[model samples]
Target: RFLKVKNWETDVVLTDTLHLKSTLETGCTEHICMGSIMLPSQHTRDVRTKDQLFPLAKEFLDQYYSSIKRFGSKAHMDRLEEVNKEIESTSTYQLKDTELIYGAKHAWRNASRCVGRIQWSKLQVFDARDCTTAHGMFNYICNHVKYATNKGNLRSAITIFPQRTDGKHDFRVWNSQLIRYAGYKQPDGSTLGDPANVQFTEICIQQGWKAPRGRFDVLPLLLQANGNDPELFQIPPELVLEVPIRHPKFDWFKDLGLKWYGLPAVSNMLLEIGGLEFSACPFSGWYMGTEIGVRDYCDNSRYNILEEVAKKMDLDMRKTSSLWKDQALVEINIAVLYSFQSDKVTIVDHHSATESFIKHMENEYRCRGGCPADWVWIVPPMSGSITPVFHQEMLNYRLTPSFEYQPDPWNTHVW
Candidate 1:
């Protein structure tokens, strides 16, 4: 029950006008309230049995998740089961073990999770194997077999996927699932692909993600700008993404039998804020329209609201867009009102990833499959909510309204 007060508790209670104005003009600041915790998968069996460790880990996460009741509902569980079944039942299983397929499927579940009321408009989690445009290969690689020509089998323990290379230098694999199989080139020049035989135990937090900003201090002002007192709003401060899988190292691309193309232009768009380039040359059509530099928008009063909106859009686009791949669905969670301002937007009060909405803003991107993400404008009421700032996403990428849970298990699959 978000509350607001000013000038003798008029019970004005931060009316719809206030909320709309704040959303339009000031464009609230959003944070990615990631609730990262360890969960047991079949893979986790190596660390400990589900009967031994998973229950405790589940208890810990559930304690944290008690607040995110929507995510805990039976419906969410049903959805997960349905989605996993579909993925497992797919013809993909008949082919080789494609890490991307599993990673993508896992990502879909992470997004489809039913947390409490705060249904994230966009919820995404990445693992080492999920998807990453920055580094082409995931933690896994292909088996090394020096083939002078396409022969049946020289020495084979079990060569599952067989690719044939015609004399014209055209090579084709038997299964698409084989595309993501991981192989390692050992010191003895042997290519291996048994998951149990490999050593892959390390946490991955240093890849490209920086720690989230402090919730209390950073969220309050954004709350105020939206014309709401944070004290009354239930804001989630932190939510961690604990998906497993690793991005590939920079080397070994040439040996992988894959050609290197320059990182896509959309990936380059993310570079604007990551300190990659000094100039703000977003590839979106909207950013190209009014060529106001990001720095200038930040400084201009007329563009203040637009600029703030731009910042949010930039954050979401840059952070979420890095994992775009050929057949992967990006999963993200958007918890509404996760953090709020207390006492005249001055003091920080409570925090929870479920009750809070700001947590959704940072990581939620416009849903995929529409016009390329050109601009996301948040109109301020004072300014007639006319035009916020325009930001760029991809040249040909789509932006659609993120889908909401419809109480249907089928919809939650890794589409």
Candidate 2:
């Protein structure tokens, strides 16, 4: 079992009290013996032991098989019967190539956080379910990068691995994303790279993975199968398109040597279709400017480059009224957009992304009868008030054939 520590804070907010009360109502919090006193477990909620897979298989069959009959595809009927037999024989159900492809696309459409869900149905699905090894996972990922990159004109795609099955080892991708910086903790306790990856990077080191000492080291893929030790595979440099960020007017900005990966391929999210979970489904679309410029680069927990840029811009550091941070943030965002355009890489600005999302909402409403979107996520990070998405009201709800966040494998493992 994993050991976690929680200390009581001297200053606690009313929100924390309410949150504690809410969790307590669900019996999610557990008390542990810690010497003389019983301490509450650090984990707030219960993790799902079983997923909604079998029900989803039946639902997909009901919908897809009916469609096949309507199309008069008698040839597909025999294959459908075979799948029906397989579904009843085992607790884990199997999806046909066409069914799996459709389900993958539908999951994208149901993703509440996606601003570019309009192209969800067009997602190129790669079936890598037969892949049982970490090296096999690596090869499929390379293929995903190579094809999706399409020489900078990035195409939206998802590579799905084997799903959870009874008596079978589940495939899990340990990396948070396909491209992330390696974090190295220094003796002084300052992190050299992305602080978010510190724990994961440490795990990699313990697992015998060697990474260069740098602020911007592109982390290798960590693939796991059946709760086994993860295997590390280096991503080909050519497959990764890095955009060197530079300001149009301020040439000194180039000397800072900042860059970001072109494609934002989310690797760790569990793809849930009908109740089955595909833990190693890596999916990607092009990036939005604010995702890189405002959040990744400017966030206090991440790079925190706002102050550095403000200092370089010769803005007053002492005055809070100077709005130097805001000024620098705008310039950084501009640099991201300019750099991507210069490299012929596909990227969307906040304004365009929001506008397209608005169009997506209209299309979904017309075609599917309703649209579900998270207002906080759909709105752009920078210039939220000015964007159309900010003004519009949105509904958020769980939809099946969707992507859900899974707990990190390291945390899930029992000692």
Candidate 3:
């Protein structure tokens, strides 16, 4: 057992759900810490073979029962037998309606990446496991978008389709987020919209989507159900709430032309509960200000509007010494924060979000002994050290009933 080291700034050895082979790989000095590096990812994935599924399913059953404070009770053992017998008899099992509901919420609770998980329990879980057709999947997703949008009072939710049985007949959404602006590749070796989504926009085009070629065209959903082929469906604009960003202090900020959808539903990740893998579950929560302002608007690879805002603000873009990026970034962050609040839309600033995360960490430690966190991710993009999470040393670990990245369907689908 190797001793886990800290950055002296903030870290220490903790024997929790961690096998610190991950720890050894993430060795750091006081000068720098690789706190965010999760080598060989900690997320659980699809349990393919029955030999693999039985144990994982049993573990989830244990988790589910224990959650109700009934672990090792008669109810727990019989439910365990029920799951095992179903699997043994048919080589597969299904979560009961209650099981599905609890599992989905726990998946949100178990996710290490999201900072807004303080609202995890309030999540509305939708079960669409009966979904069979692409058209049907689109309808279910529309309802999900409608309910979660809530006319701008955004709610966290997830819609689960059928599980990936034998890793065949998989159902998935092609969009990383349920609603994102189209990124059109221009003829002049540049892009016209969100560059991050250029490839997805291109895919929509190849699927015969009429390209709007605008800066903020909402991309269509590519719904692939039962692994036949992906089909594109435009989200009804009426169901999608959008915020037009404006600064309360700066008049010119509105002219910069920035907007984002109200929903942040991640549609492509697989959801694993116990050992069951749901390949096409879309989940959403509200946004953190930095995600929209700092990452989406200012990331060199995303919108790259830092220099534009700096120029408008008359900051010296010619030199980093002037801290123009920071100056413009703060204004942009304010604009996003104020705009969302003015519009009565749900969003959180980094300061409040990080503070809430500290509370979450305390609850997790008191109840579960450890919390999985990516200090790299939890530390907000713009103000890293100033936030509460940056100074607090944390352990990175994987827990079950979790959500994780699955292979892109286009890359893995056979037909």
Candidate 4:
């Protein structure tokens, strides 16, 4: 009950004073308020205690802890109830560094969309739970970039921040990825750069973040905390390892001045564990060539360079029967793979990636009695007919310790 005590009157409540500032504009000192005037504020809602949250917590704990025990972590069996007690008392659960590391790697293992799940257990997990400010997030991301980029070696890693708590604000990374091209709309009703990033680029510009005047300009980091306004930080150019696009057959393609980052670090996805959500958990894996070549560089709404490349190659673009787009698309993917390999960057071609995924499915089936796979996502974007995964029947089902795509912060209406 929000009783107006005499002590609270002298407490200088900022919300009351802020409300009064606008209310006094009409020159009224004596406020005459109607229904719901300060007794149990409208913002107040019933908060869940430890008892209420324990059931779901126990479900997650039993599933993962049992899985951990199978993986030879016998200590997890003893600490299960101890951790439960801690969660019961504080209404918060603390996962050990070992558990966090295992959970993160296991999450990647359970990521259905990824074709490179064979390397799931090798992921490096960085715990940045104490970081709560925009500046701290910037530093953490920079470290992640520097380490993961690894001078073209491209290590897979995930940096996790603190999980959300009741009534507290959520921290979020506003950018889709740590590095992406800026999209600038021209007066001629065309985009000069990546059309995919136009919305994000506009928001950055609106917030006074400066972008370069070029087609391939890198965007700044837009990090937010406590539901406060987002802050921009410049990522060091040296930290971002980019591979310049060039094909062995088409030297003219290099003249297009195209390049993409070596790593596909997705920064906007939510990481959920034991009923807790880490909105700012950014993770990355080595790129599959089609993700950059077919989707980013050749998509109709994106770079749309297929027609341009096909035209330079003297292929007839007059009809779809010419197969000019398909021919050029293959060349673009070839260039992406060749360039990354020449630069000593870790990347997988779709042929090898799909093969690895089939092996990953086999391994998982042997280890867990069953494996969940999304056939649509498991199939490569290019050359789906030739890959073994295309013919394989797969199951798509929910599994704990998984990576989930959440709604974009800017796209979502609620805070």
Candidate 5:
């Protein structure tokens, strides 16, 4: 039995004032807690047999049909039988065009870590299952970047690549994001550009890319199709929307030379629908201001600009009690919001985004019973207690039709 929230000691549901009517217990119990584990411990089959695949496929078809309110209908029954027979004959099956679209939207909705699931039903899913070559993959990727970017008014979208057939012939995208800054190790043992992308930058460099060594040089897309080696494709600068960071009041902020890409397209996550997994599917969405400001600009691991911004503002660098970090942090976040706003780019601030997420959670609970959320990820980074999500008790669990982390291509293959 799950512990009651009032018990305090046994309560896994951490909350202050917020309460959930009905709750689901996680893998956590009194003995151990798995709240922090991102990837739940499991080994998945690379190649599923007909018997295994059919049941999984049925589960997916059930969700898809039920989603459209056509459950147990003639069309639903017919499609279910068709998929079962198709799997029996060929050990695999295909998704209908409409099914592909619906499944993608459900995958976005199933993402527990995303605060933007309120826009889940509105996602534009582009089917690229026919793409077989790296060049063709690059073309589709370029077009996705173009359509979703929409010249700064960002749209949430995803491009689905071919599903993994045999374990050996999987299609994979090497980059974590469609557009990312290259990171390089310097002679002074300092890092240049985004430190998060250091390994991918090295991979790009080794693949014949001329590293410009600039702090914000957009790295090329590394496309790999049907088990082939990754090929680098340069993203057109004209197609990439970049907003230069400048505070609303501080003129000196413009001289800091900070900028970030408008699109947050994640290219490396695996998309699972029914029993099939698209190994190279890339999904994108508009950024929350803190994603750029708090994480990209101020995080010690990333750009680490707190001291620089504080020094410019002439805040006392010597002591922690002066709240210099807090002052500079808010200013940086303000700069990010203002820059995106001034440039007509789509970016949501943390306060607004948090409120939207609460609405989403309410809707999800009514529609699907429980909305799984990682409390750690749902809360804002800087202002923890001030946000509504911080007080809300959330349970984290895995759900089907989900976007998930997969092993990197380079990690599995030796160069």
Candidate 6:
């Protein structure tokens, strides 16, 4: 029963299934402007293998993916609502965790809006740069945090970062998606008033919040006396008991003006208290950073290695003692390894903050004359894409182990 062109209204009613099927399958953002609802693959189905067997695998897989995606969306949105409820419930004029939650939610929303879409379009195709933005980076950070938290890799929450730029310089945020919900201060000590332009350090200073450091920043890298285990170094014979505390003597409560715990230096204090080796270098903490010029995101391979190490440590504590302010409180970390070979300097300034992180790690960790693990790392994209570069450059650099207290550990690669 087909309706003639003169009766277009009837055509829609009769072809509703065809229209919806086309809309769901063929009318991708590639062809239409109806903002993407569910992805094309959302309606997946497999052919039946047996005469009576139902196509349940496809249904299960679809449901699984759908549930995962929905859970993420709901968790994010629910956090926002939680913040609002907190704000409404508060009696004081100021906001605390609620504000952080709200700000993170807004920033994440903006970031996801830019993902998998075109900023510049000719007909329907989008250019590569279209999907790249600080928002996407922020979104990635938030999602990564969520994933890390649910996966019990809560240590990853604080350190995941995104590549953000403000028409000039590039930087990243710690845990939250929004950078400067307040404003940015210019070089003259005046505020730039733009959240994106605000430096992370400046924000912490302004908010009167505790100066934050990634969890990995304070994680101990205690070398096993003769093997791979934490207990082996519990009371090692070779390491000195009373080494000089080279760290600056300042009260975190007075100086940075927040809780005395969770500052960048607090982990060192705790590590010392625990008689453990703590490394602040973001890169050195993970799979011996090998590349000469790249920033560390989570080292998936190295993290797996660490987890394996953690499982075998035989200690009552699974992760190192420094991963938390204390049990029952979770802190986020921007765990990263940043480095650049001498060759990188020729192409780009190798001493940027991220790269400096590489230098910092080399200084703190890289056990002197220690065994080096030859491994590879892969990087995933914020656009939900993975690049081959991560695989291509895995072995291009070698993470030479350095003993603690070596000068210029970052610049020098131990053999």
TM-score of each: 0.16, 0.84, 0.91, 0.84, 0.92, 0.17
The digit string of per-residue lDDT tens for model 6 on 203-314 reads 3444344322322211112211111111100111121111111112222212211110111101111000001111211110111121210111123421112332222332
Worst 10 residues of 3 by lDDT: 18-27
lDDT: the better of candidates 5 and 6: 5
- Model 3: per-residue lDDT, tens digit, 1-415? 5323233344533434333312112335568865545534444244367787788888777778877899999999998898889988888898999889988887787667778878888889999999999999999999999999998898888999999886678898988989999997777888788999988898889878998788999999999999888998999889989999989988998997789888999998888876778889999889999999998999889898988888888887887899989999999999998999999999999999999988887677557665777777788998888887888776665566777777777777787
Clashing pairs in 5: none
Per-residue lDDT over 73-153 for candidate 2, one digit per residue giving the tens place of the 0 to 100 score: 665556556655665666456677988887898778876678988788789999998897898889999999999999999
Candidate 6: Cα lDDT at 282: 15
Off by over 4 Å in 4: 1-52, 68-78, 411-415
| Of candidates 4 and 3, the better by TM-score | 3
Taking the tens digit of each residue's C-alpha lDDT, what string does model 1 give over 374-415? 122221111111221111111111111111111111122121
> How many steric overlaps does candidate 1 have?
49
RMSD of each: 25.1, 10.0, 3.6, 16.9, 3.9, 26.6
Candidate 5 residues lying further than 4 Å off, grouped into runs, are 1-30, 42-45
lDDT of 5 by residue, 1-415 (tens): 3322221223334232222322223456789987776555331225676676887788888878887899999999999999988888888899999999988998888677889889999999899999989999999998999999999878989999999998777788899899999999889998999998988899888778999899999999888888878898998899999999999999999999999999999998888888798998999999999998999888889999999999999999898999999999999999999999999999999999988988787677656666767787888888977877777777666667777778888988534
Q: Which has the greatest lDDT?
A: 5
Quality of model 5 by C-alpha lDDT: 0.84
lDDT of each candidate versus the true structure: 0.19, 0.76, 0.82, 0.76, 0.84, 0.22
Task: Show the lowest summed lDDT stretch of 10 residues, model 5.
Answer: 15-24
